[PDB]
Amino acid sequence: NVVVKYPVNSELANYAEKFWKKELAIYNLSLILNKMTPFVKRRSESYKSSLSAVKEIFKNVDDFQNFLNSVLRRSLDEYRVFFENYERLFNSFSSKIFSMRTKSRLVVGLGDESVYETSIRLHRNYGVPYIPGSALKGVAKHYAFSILARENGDEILRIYESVKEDLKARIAKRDKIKKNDVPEDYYLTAAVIQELFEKKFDELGAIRNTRVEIGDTVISVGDIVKIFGTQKEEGSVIFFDAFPTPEQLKDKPNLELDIMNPHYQPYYQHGEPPGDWHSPNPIFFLTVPAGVEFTFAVASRDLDDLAEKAEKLLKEALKKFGVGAKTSLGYGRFDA
């Protein structure tokens, strides 16, 4: 058997114990996940507070997922009225609203410092997954950077050899010596483009005439820098957060589990040789399953054409680049 201990104060310890055994209903997922952490103890003489460890206290993984979704499903009415209010907020500004479904799995906020050694962007009030608008703006900006680098790599390097040499020197100082390694590749092109868009925004006037193709329409560099704003000018497009539509929150689960099984972890960390040893230790992280529908909205402040251009570019970014964690493994991809 197993022993479960709670590091919370008295009284609330017993109440949380009752909550986890499904004796008493729980309506807020964030609260039960964060402030009522169970410290499940395995045959080892320790209390592991990991998601893998707390999975054990259930019958199986499916019971865990069903319990989490049931806790989420109780708050459906309050979340529905909140979503109605949020949609009303969208209609006030002349914003563009589009909806995309999770083509693959999505996980945002995997890196926040939690006791579980992993986390997930859950709303503080209703405990639902959502994508912060900062993440949307960042992924849109980085996809614009990547498209610019791929389309006009060497050209801007010729135009801006001074700052690219400065960046190469900076990399050389940080990375051992590497005095003149400086591979003039897409990585360095993206780096110098970001440096232009972050600290040398004034120099972008020369390249403002250039246009990059996104989707079907073309977008100027000056249009992009006006969209995302600089250190001296505020952005002209508002990036709202993304929330799942509450209609599907009752039929299909909005949350599910995923597995991390790092074999050869000592090889990666302590430098041990690879091979058929170093018994892997698996831990789990929560993530919204594929097919979950989300609602996105972007509102301009000067020109609505800027809003529609930002909407198209963000749609392309979510289609190709993706948002959230594991964007290099196909996670966080959307489709129409």
Binding site: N34, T37, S114
Partner: protein
């Protein structure tokens, strides 16, 4: 004469950070891991509470709960660098919350009679909120001193 609690906070943080720097000067990994853990600890306390953070420190230490007396922990008796850093952080936090900067100092400690983990176990929420404020303040001081004088990674 009176002494402000901020002075005791700074003195304790400097003492512990200088102690870890001097004892493990050769161990770059220990210093880097301790700095990262000190910078990441306040967020964990805010998200999951002080008691959960204190227990999670002991979870990595492999020591069991309900036998948690900080005076009975030898933080150097752990082979792994991560275990060393976690033991140092837990010992510093518990020492601050139990004794402060000493009896003669201005801050004699909040709990003052037992381990702060037990304090959180069997005391009211106002006291644990006071302890959480104290822990956040001392953690900020320790994080500042570690980011200043301890080697990062």
């Amino acid at each position: 004469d009176i002494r402000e609690i901020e002075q005791e906070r700074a003195s304790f943080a400097f003492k512990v950070v200088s102690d870890i720097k001097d004892k493990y000067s050769q161990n770059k990994k220990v210093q880097g891991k301790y700095s990262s853990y000190a910078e990441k600890a306040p967020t964990i306390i805010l998200n999951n509470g002080l008691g959960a953070t204190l227990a999670f420190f002991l979870s990595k230490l492999e020591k069991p709960i309900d036998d948690v007396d900080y005076k009975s922990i030898n933080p150097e008796s752990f082979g792994n660098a991560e275990n060393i850093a976690y033991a140092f952080l837990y010992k510093h936090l518990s020492t601050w919350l139990a004794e402060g900067n000493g009896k003669d100092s201005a801050f004699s400690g909040l709990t003052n009679g037992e381990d702060p983990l037990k304090y959180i176990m069997e005391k009211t929420a106002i006291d644990v909120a006071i302890s959480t404020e104290e822990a956040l303040s001392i953690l900020n001081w320790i994080k500042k001193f570690a980011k200043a004088m301890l080697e990062e990674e």
